[PDB]
Write a protein that binds this ligand. Structure first.
Ligand SMILES: [Mg+2]
Ligand SMILES: [Zn+2]
Lengths: 1362, 79, 277, 49, 49
RNA sequence: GAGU
DNA sequence: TCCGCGTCAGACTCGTAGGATTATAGCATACGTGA
DNA sequence: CACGTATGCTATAATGTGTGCAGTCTGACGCGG
């Protein structure tokens, strides 16, 4: 029953007969009258076994009294009926048949192995034409197709000494006679003469096929079927419905087809039929076999009366409905329930309300066993009837069993592991599950009718798995980011906000209280408001340098409310944390602080307390929503009438034919966009600080206690954006096009929209909602791919003993520090003794987990950058070490060995995308774009420091930059980067490089809706390849007549001017070119498509003038829909459409020759003196200027980088950090926290494989691709033995191909592409020894990770020692 | 032990091994009827095993010791 | 290039020459007398007739190609049993064999559960009767309305219309949503689930334990008869094979074991409690 | 979709050229569809069904 | 909980006997998978230990 | 059709 | 080497209802098992 | 023998399919000319 590994190989005719326990010779299923199996039919009991246990058909031998007996009368063995799902049969085919999977499933396999095109084989198979098997006369060569009339010619002339045949017989004979050995050596010899790239691929392909064929012990004959296996009856059942009807599997219709045509062929052969008829029957037989194996593959799938194509064998393995996806990696499960969920605010964090009726049924066997131990139930039938009657004593027993027994709650969809949590159940009368509020966040559960699923862990092991790993109290922190996922929301935040926040005097200002208990006493007595500003004596407890906690006592100036909340606060936390007015953002930091100082128990109790008090005071507060809470600013109608006269001015300027339609569109949209901000700001000043109505002496100003403001400000619910629509102006809506409507919604929701404003709202709304339903599937597919590629990766070792790691640096995207070095590096092993600036004393050690204390020290020392141990640089083979990974973010300490990290990583990366696809879309309505980045303003005074910039002074007297990627740093006094910006091309700098600037001053200024082409030289403009009609167009106006030129691209361009590049050439007064200073490049700026030009031919220019203005339409909502495709292209390692060029080797740059403008590059390094040339397109312009010391991987031309090139030139750390940063840019744009180490896991899996270029001491040799783990283990044994070392190159693989590259074919087939995977594995004779998780889940065994790592390593040592 | 398992995890260390050790002990009380060290206070075998590990009475190594002790004394008795 | 099995076959038959009366008789004389060529030429020439007829018997049970092969087999029997000396033409004679062979094959293969020709032909006459009845009775005909018309038993008519109930496919999904089909709801009835299996274990172990509490002789006369502890289920007279060798004394001791065991079930709390079971 | 005629065009079918290829479709209530369409080289083609 | 037919009944009896012992085997769907793949004419065998 |  | 045709993928649980259709002549002599 | 199941034979002349639908989905990645 327990086996070690699984092999797939080709089924021999002989092998198929081994499984068969009888030949089916009849289409008969059963007798119409006695529904008993028909003789030698598809359900024959004489072949597949007895229908009833230990009973023959005719009923001569019954029960175990006759054990192995074969009834002489009926011919049925008396055994278990179980065998009818087990025993197979077979069919003897009168003509051989091709196995469609090894014919149509590409690569052709049968064609690839004969080196015969597929078309050619089929023409042979359908009996269109003859194929030569052996022309002894070299006059006719092998595998040469002869038509009907070509066979008649050679037939008389040569005849005899040529054998050519037709149909499956021919190809099978051709396969049989081919000698794999001899042809192998022949092809190897041909490979040596002139191996062109594609010739060498196809030759190496057939070589590996021949080698693999001899190693597999598969024979080519077996590609052709002479014996056809029959699936067991119960696996293709014919069962009677209640209504006297029958229902049967489609396989039975398909088997019947095949048997009828095959037996008819036997008949036609016995009858010596004429050949055309024989042929048609052989075609028919091949059609029916092909239909039976894989229906919709070769042509039209054969249909039932329903129109629908019959489901074939291949279909039952293939796709979602197939065995793997549906019945084997996911299952229907016993001891499972589901119901509506509702709140249980009374519950503690480790509890859930479980309906009595539900729990009575889930724990049925436990109740029966306890009932027999109490002697209440005599037997199981009596126990059953006692529970059916629901007797009073049974409830007391049920109550006894469920105590200390954890149950699993699950919510769909299960995106990360927290989607399942364990609780201790609390029995409740009533049919809905009660959920703890604080874990609503992990489940994404809101009680608008949500339902959840219940699972009972049965075994002692399962119970302890639930209580220790999966209990809600044990799982607080997100595994994705080191952040507490359990955080108060909604009413809880509102209550605490209400209590902490202060008010002017109110009841009992400036009183003095003995303890927070006197404060509570005063409030509930009615002599003090919660917002009274009163001084109280609190004793806070601060932790000292050692374990001992220090207590201190002082007079704090807080309010009554804050004093009462201090009672919930544990001793150990400072009083100052509650002394501010508390919002959601402050309460999360409260919980974090609590967790790091006190630990788990205190945090859990504290969290519960916070929930109780939060609700309680929310309800006391009497907080409500009236229409008077939505306050319109008095100055709306003025702002709007003004903005309306303004838009009228530009409409009038359009009607005059001066301003173009596009300019007016842009300026009307700008007017309204500013009007909207002004109205919103007016509402928010009038609402935020509208309590200008206070007291004590005379009038004072304070925060408004308007309900909706409190809700938004606390972070309980709503935001300023929502309030804009409610009380302010709704704003500009977006069309389904994405384009924005010119006339915005002037009204708000309190005011009420009119028919047109509402109709316009609809578009955006429904686009959002449709995005939720439809896009969630692309995101989920990405989760699935990710999970599949990181499956196997588990913590295997403690310490790999590697010195390797990636040098991380602080992240400063935009301007605000997005990812601090500490935040990026926290809880990461520090590889290599990394000290302080002055290299003369070790600051930090080697293997040392970065703890919060250590990270705090890094900030005091101002560490620039740190080498940190990463998953990618781990040496552990078949997994990673705890050190290279670092902290389990979900635990708050160093990861445990055995934890299945890859799955965690893929879940962590995938979930946000999948969930954000639903968030800003059911809710996604109002369109609020923002991209008016015109000028950069510096805030901290400092010296201007530009990097990778090549500007040039203009006529005006300003530093105009002529570089694409230009960055602007902000050096301080000592000298360290504080702020960083992105200066685009053609930007005007106020000061130059090294110049000092003051705070709040525009350093850089430019136009956002335009990408200028700026010159580097002065003189006149020449038109080259700018023929009117072919490449450009022309349009004039009136009296004077200013014409603009618009450059057409390959879309709007004729076939005449396709190879013509349009460019504005610079010339001097004479008419000759103007050399660009210090280069042999005549000045020529190539204009791209849709480039608008105002200067016509023959116009004088200075350096720094704008030649043309390329439009920059970027009015998108970005959101998520658009980001995930970027992410998917990264993880799939797609080379971009115009990749940048990079230097392959270090040395000295030499420009060479040109093929009509196409740039050759004759590059000559110093030590590697032999030259290296590369062809470059004519129009692609290089950023660097030749004659240069180039490092490996210096950017030559601007463009996106292919991850493959990055790996190939600058190695692993380079490409790992490219993917990490580029992906993280997307998720950071959406405010999603994912640690780099997760993306680094997946990257490692992408870099699994490596291609060997040059032979080792093993049988690797040129061009084999093997796992890097295996070749490094080989290189360990080579170092010890010497011999020929193996030279190799690591290869990057996209997620999909990387998952298919795993040696495990069960894993590969279960993912996707299943037909192809199983043919490749079957032909290679591949054996899966089941190391991976997928594989073990499929066979229903113990996982090789987590709990299972103990048992699985104990098996691995049993395996190692015999 | 019931609500929070953190201190029990801090005794053994590996959550995964804590589960195996507490399951093997709970099986002893469930089937062998092996006597509890801590007062049960009406708790199930699983909880007793976790309390025993928290207080540091049960250990993978200690279980293996008492396994050979009792098995070897039975071998002695047979011969 | 044509890779359609049908178009290729139809092309092949197209290019064989159509026969005249005297050609048919000349070939056929030698064909009956055994001329390999003669039978082949007559068959290959008259394939086109087969296709014309198989095209009229379409959209029913099998597909066109399937029909054409069985039709060919009919034409073969016609060439084997043709009478050249009779003045009657070949085409007329072959028509019978091809229609005949096609109809007979469409009766055995058209149905997943093979219906014998007798049942099928019976049914067909009931059906054509029903068509005439429906054409004068506007509303469809009842089982008794058909039976009344044939003067035949209502059970005969109803049993035959029962056999006409056509199969449903297990794999055909329900509810327009290609989600769950019959397989996905149809439960294993033959193999019952673990509550029933475990009940039987408890029942069998209960009676085995009851014999240990009953008299040794009573447990060696009651268990071995029913085959509970013995190997073979014996009867009152057959318990004489073991050691009993009695007819009266075996019958008294079987029932004496039952009377003491009935009071063991009245006291434990079953008897009439486990009577409903 | 109402039977009749309809003039359509994928705006940049081949993303490489990005050329707008115009097409016509005659949609009957019963019968074969009749399609007219441009190629990149501006050659008018006809396709049935 | 699912396919293992031996496992489910044995487990049930263990639950009624208090002992929550795990007595697993092979899910019946995998046995089917194998039979389906051999019906395709691909030899898939278990190599034991 | 129910919650994403 | 580039157009063109082919094949392959496209979240997770929950609900509801059961199922449709056609038509195969008519009669005379065999083939097989129980009695 | 009988009851159910099968095999058989017809003699005007007849001699190349269609048939009922599919509705266009899409972005990607290989594979023959
Ligand atoms: Mg909801
Ligand atoms: Zn029998």
């Amino acid at each position: 029953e327990e086996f070690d590994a699984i092999k797939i190989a080709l089924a021999s005719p002989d092998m198929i007969r081994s499984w068969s326990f009888g030949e089916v010779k009849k289409p008969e299923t059963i007798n119409y009258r006695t529904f008993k199996p028909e003789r030698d039919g598809l359900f024959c009991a004489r072949i597949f076994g007895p229908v009833k246990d230990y009973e023959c058909l005719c009923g001569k031998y019954k029960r175990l009294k006759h054990r192995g007996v074969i009834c002489e009368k009926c011919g049925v063995e008396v055994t278990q009926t179980k065998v009818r799902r087990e025993r197979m049969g077979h069919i003897e085919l009168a003509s051989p048949t091709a196995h469609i999977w090894f014919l149509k499933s590409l690569p052709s396999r049968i064609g690839l192995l004969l080196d015969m095109p597929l078309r050619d084989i089929e023409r042979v198979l359908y009996f269109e034409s003859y194929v030569v098997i052996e022309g002894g006369m070299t006059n006719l060569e092998r595998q040469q197709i002869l038509t009907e009339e070509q066979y008649l010619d050679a037939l008389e002339e040569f005849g005899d000494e040529f054998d050519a045949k037709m149909g499956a017989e021919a190809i099978q004979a051709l396969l049989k006679s081919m000698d794999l050995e001899q042809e192998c050596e022949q092809l190897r010899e041909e490979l040596n003469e002139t191996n062109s790239e594609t010739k060498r691929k196809k030759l190496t392909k057939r070589i590996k096929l021949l080698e693999a064929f001899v190693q597999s012990g598969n024979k080519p004959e077996w590609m052709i079927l002479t014996v056809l296996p029959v699936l067991p009856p119960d696996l293709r059942p014919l069962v009677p419905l209640d209504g006297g009807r029958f229902a049967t599997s489609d396989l039975n219709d398909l088997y019947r087809r095949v048997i009828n045509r095959n037996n008819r062929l036997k008949r036609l052969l016995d009858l010596a039929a004429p050949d055309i008829i024989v042929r048609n029957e052989k075609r028919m037989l091949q059609e029916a076999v092909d239909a039976l194996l894989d229906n919709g593959r070769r042509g039209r799938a054969i249909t039932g009366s329903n129109k629908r194509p019959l489901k074939s064998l291949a279909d039952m393995i293939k796709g979602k409905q197939g065995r793997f996806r549906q019945n084997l990696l996911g299952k229907r499960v016993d001891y499972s329930g589901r119901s509506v969920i509702t709140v249980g605010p009374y519950l503690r964090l480790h509890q859930c309300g479980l309906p009595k009726k539900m729990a009575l049924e889930l724990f049925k066997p436990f109740i029966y066993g306890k009932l027999e131990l109490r002697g209440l139930a005599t037997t199981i039938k009596a126990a059953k009837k006692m529970v059916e009657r629901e007797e009073a004593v049974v409830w007391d027993i049920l109550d006894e069993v469920i105590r200390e027994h954890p149950v699993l709650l699950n919510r769909a969809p299960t995106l990360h592991r927290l989607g399942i949590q364990a609780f201790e159940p609390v029995l409740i009368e009533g049919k809905a599950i009660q959920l703890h509020p604080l874990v609503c966040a992990a489940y994404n559960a809101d009680f608008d009718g949500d339902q959840m699923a219940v699972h009972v862990p049965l075994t002692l092991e399962a119970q302890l798995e639930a209580r220790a790993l999966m209990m809600s109290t044990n799982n607080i922190l997100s595994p994705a980011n080191g952040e507490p996922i359990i955080v108060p929301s909604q009413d809880v935040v509102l209550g605490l906000y209400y209590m902490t926040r202060d008010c002017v005097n109110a009841k009992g200002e400036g009183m003095v209280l003995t303890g927070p208990k006197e404060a509570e006493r005063l409030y509930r007595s009615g002599l003090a408001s919660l917002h009274a500003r009163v001084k109280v004596r609190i004793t806070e407890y601060e932790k000292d340098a050692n374990g001992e906690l220090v207590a201190k006592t002082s007079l704090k100036d807080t309010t009554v409310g804050r004093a009462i909340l201090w009672m919930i606060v544990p001793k150990g936390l400072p009083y100052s944390i509650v002394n501010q007015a508390l919002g959601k953002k402050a309460i999360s930091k409260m919980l974090n602080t609590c967790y790091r100082i006190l630990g788990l128990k205190p945090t859990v109790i504290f969290a519960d307390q916070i929930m109780y008090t939060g609700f309680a005071y929310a309800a006391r507060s009497g907080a409500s929503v009236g229409i008077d809470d939505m306050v319109i600013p008095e100055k709306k109608h003025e702002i709007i009438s003004e903005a309306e006269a303004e838009v009228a001015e530009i409409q009038e300027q359009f009607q005059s034919g001066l301003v173009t339609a596009g300019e007016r569109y842009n300026k009307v949209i700008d007017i309204w966009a500013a009007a909207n901000d002004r109205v919103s700001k007016a509402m928010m000043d009038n609402l935020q600080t509208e309590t200008v109505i206070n007291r004590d002496g005379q009038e004072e100003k304070q925060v408004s206690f308007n309900s909706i403001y409190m809700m938004a400000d606390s972070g309980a619910r709503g935001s300023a954006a929502q309030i804009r629509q409610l009380a302010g102006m709704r704003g500009l809506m977006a069309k389904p096009d994405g384009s924005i409507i010119e006339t915005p919604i002037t009204a708000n929701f309190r005011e009420g929209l009119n028919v047109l404003q509402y109709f316009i709202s609809t578009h955006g709304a429904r686009k959002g909602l449709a995005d939720t339903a439809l896009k969630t599937a692309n995101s989920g597919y990405l989760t699935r791919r990710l999970v599949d590629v990181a499956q196997d990766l588990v913590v295997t070792e403690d310490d790999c003993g590697t010195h390797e790691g990636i040098m991380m640096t602080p992240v400063i995207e935009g301007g605000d520090v997005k990812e601090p070095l500490r935040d990026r590096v926290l809880g990461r092993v520090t590889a290599e003794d990394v000290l302080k600036p002055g290299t003369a004393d070790i600051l930090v050690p080697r293997n040392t987990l970065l703890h919060e204390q250590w990270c705090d020290l890094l900030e005091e020392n101002s560490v620039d950058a740190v080498k940190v141990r990463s998953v990618v640089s781990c040496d552990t083979d078949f997994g990673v070490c705890a050190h290279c990974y670092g902290r389990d973010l979900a635990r708050g300490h160093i990861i445990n060995k055995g934890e299945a990290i890859g799955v965690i990583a893929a879940q962590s990366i995938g979930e946000p995308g999948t969930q954000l696809t639903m968030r800003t879309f059911h809710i996604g309505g109002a369109a609020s774009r923002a991209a008016a980045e015109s000028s950069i303003q510096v805030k901290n005074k400092g010296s201007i420091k530009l990097s990778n910039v090549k500007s040039v002074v203009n006529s005006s007297g300003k530093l105009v930059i002529t570089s694409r990627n230009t960055e602007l740093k902000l050096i301080d006094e000592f000298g360290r980067t504080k702020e960083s910006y992105k200066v685009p091309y053609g930007a005007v700098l106020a000061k130059g490089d090294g110049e000092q600037v003051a705070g709040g001053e525009t350093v850089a200024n430019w136009d956002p809706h335009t990408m200028p082409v700026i010159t580097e030289v002065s003189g006149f403009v020449r038109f080259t390849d700018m023929i009117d009609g072919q490449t450009i167009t022309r349009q004039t106006d009136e009296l004077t007549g200013l014409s603009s030129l618009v450059v057409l691209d390959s879309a709007e361009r004729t076939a005449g001017g396709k190879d013509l590049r349009p460019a504005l050439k610079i010339v001097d007064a004479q008419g000759n070119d103007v050399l660009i200073p210090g280069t042999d490049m005549p000045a020529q700026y190539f204009l791209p498509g849709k480039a608008i030009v105002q200067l016509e031919d023959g116009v004088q220019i200075s350096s720094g003038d704008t030649l043309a203005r390329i439009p920059q339409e970027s009015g998108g909502t970005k959101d998520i829909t658009g980001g995930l495709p970027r992410v998917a292209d990264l993880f799939e390692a797609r080379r971009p459409k115009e990749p940048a060029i990079l230097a392959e080797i270090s040395g000295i740059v030499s420009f060479g020759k040109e093929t009509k403008g196409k740039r050759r590059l004759v590059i000559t390094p110093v030590d590697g003196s032999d030259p290296y040339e590369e062809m470059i397109p004519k129009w692609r312009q290089l950023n660097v200027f030749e004659g240069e010391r180039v490092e490996r991987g210096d950017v030559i031309s601007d463009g996106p980088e292919a991850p493959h090139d990055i790996l190939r030139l600058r190695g692993v750390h380079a490409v790992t950090r490219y993917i990490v940063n580029e992906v993280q840019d997307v998720y950071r744009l959406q405010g999603v926290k994912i640690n780099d180490k997760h993306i680094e896991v997946i990257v490692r899996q992408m870099l699994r494989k490596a291609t060997i270029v040059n032979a080792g001491s093993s049988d690797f040799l040129e061009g084999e691709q093997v796992e890097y783990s295996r070749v490094k283990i080989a290189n360990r044994e080579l170092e010890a033995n010497g011999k020929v070392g193996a030279t190799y190159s690591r290869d990057l693989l996209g997620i999909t191909k990387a998952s298919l590259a795993t040696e495990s074919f069960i894993s590969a087939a279960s993912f996707q592409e299943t037909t192809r995977v199983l043919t490749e594995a079957a032909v290679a004779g591949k054996r899966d020894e089941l190391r991976g998780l997928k594989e073990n889940v499929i066979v229903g065994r113990l996982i090789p990770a987590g709990t299972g790592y103990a048992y699985h390593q104990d098996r691995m040592r049993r395996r190692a020692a015999g | 032990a019931r609500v929070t398992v953190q201190d029990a995890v801090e005794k053994i260390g590996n959550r995964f091994d804590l589960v195996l050790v507490a399951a093997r002990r709970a099986r002893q009380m469930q089937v062998g009827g092996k006597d509890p060290l801590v007062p049960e206070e009406n708790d199930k075998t699983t909880v007793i095993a976790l309390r025993e590990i928290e207080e540091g009475l049960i250990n993978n190594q200690i279980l293996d010791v008492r396994e050979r002790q009792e098995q070897q004394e039975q071998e002695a008795a047979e011969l | 290039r044509v890779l359609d099995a049908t178009q290729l076959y139809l092309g092949e038959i197209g290019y064989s020459p159509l026969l005249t009366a005297e050609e048919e008789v000349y070939f056929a004389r030698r064909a009956l007398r055994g001329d390999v060529a003669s039978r082949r030429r007559m068959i290959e020439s008259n394939l086109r007739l087969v296709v014309k007829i198989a095209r009229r018997y379409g959209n029913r049970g099998l597909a066109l190609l399937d029909l054409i092969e069985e039709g060919n087999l009919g034409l073969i029997r016609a060439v084997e049993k043709f009478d050249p000396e009779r003045g009657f033409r070949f085409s007329t004679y072959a028509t019978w064999w091809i229609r005949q062979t096609i109809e007979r094959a469409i009766m055995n293969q058209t149905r997943t559960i093979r219906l014998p020709i007798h049942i099928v032909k019976e049914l067909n006459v009931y059906l054509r009767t029903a068509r005439e009845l429906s054409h004068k009775l506007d509303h469809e005909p009842s089982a008794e309305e058909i039976a009344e018309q044939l003067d035949k038993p209502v059970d005969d008519v109803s049993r035959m219309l029962r056999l006409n109930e056509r199969i449903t496919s297990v794999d055909t999904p329900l509810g327009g949503d290609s989600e769950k089909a019959l397989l996905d709801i149809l439960a294993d009835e033959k193999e019952n689930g673990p509550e029933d299996t475990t009940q039987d274990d408890d029942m069998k172990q209960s009676i085995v334990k009851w014999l240990f509490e009953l008299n040794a002789k009573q447990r060696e006369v009651l268990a071995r008869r029913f085959g509970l502890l013995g190997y073979e289920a014996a009867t009152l007279e057959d318990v004489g094979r073991e050691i009993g060798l009695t007819r009266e004394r075996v019958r008294q001791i079987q029932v004496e074991g039952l009377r003491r065991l009935r009071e063991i079930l009245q006291t434990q709390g079953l008897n009439i409690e486990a009577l409903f079971l | 979709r109402s039977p009749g005629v309809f003039f359509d065009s994928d705006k940049g079918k081949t993303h490489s050229s990005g050329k707008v290829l115009y097409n016509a479709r005659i949609i009957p209530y019963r019968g074969s569809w009749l399609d007219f369409e441009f190629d990149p080289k501006d050659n008018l083609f006809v396709r049935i069904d | 909980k699912s396919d293992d037919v031996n496992g489910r009944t044995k487990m049930y009896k263990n639950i009624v006997d208090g002992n929550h012992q795990m007595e697993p085997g092979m899910p019946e769907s995998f046995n089917v998978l194998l039979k389906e793949i051999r019906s395709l004419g691909i030899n898939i065998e278990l190599e034991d230990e």
